[PDB]
Amino acid sequence: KLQDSLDAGVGNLVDADLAKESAKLQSLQTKQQLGVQALSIANQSSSSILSLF
Amino acid sequence: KLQDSLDAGVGNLVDADLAKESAKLQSLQTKQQLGVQALSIANQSSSSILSLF
């Protein structure tokens, strides 16, 4: 019983809760897609100058 | 007879009624699957934002 209690304590110390990761992962993939699109929009700033000349 | 009465009283104090557990177990299994499906539906809320960009 003491061995099982020590294993349960190690699991309480280190084990991740994957159910939270199931949402946070998809949120981060949506966030990286939005960040890539925002960087693609920011990259275009130099093109506006060409119209002026 | 006294020892038999004492053992019957201990059984009245601590023993479970397993016939009720036989229904509660199946109901809780169905409820657990339904909760897993509902949480899986809840995880997907971020995906709708990608359609707007």
UniProtKB/TrEMBL annotation, chains A, B:
The gene is fljK. Residues 1-53 form the Flagellin C-terminal domain. In C.crescentus, the flagellar filament is composed of multiple flagellins of 29 kDa; 27 kDa and 25 kDa. It is found in: Secreted; Bacterial flagellum. This is Flagellin. Flagellin is the subunit protein which polymerizes to form the filaments of bacterial flagella. Transmembrane segments: none annotated. Belongs to the bacterial flagellin family. It comes from Caulobacter vibrioides (strain NA1000 / CB15N).
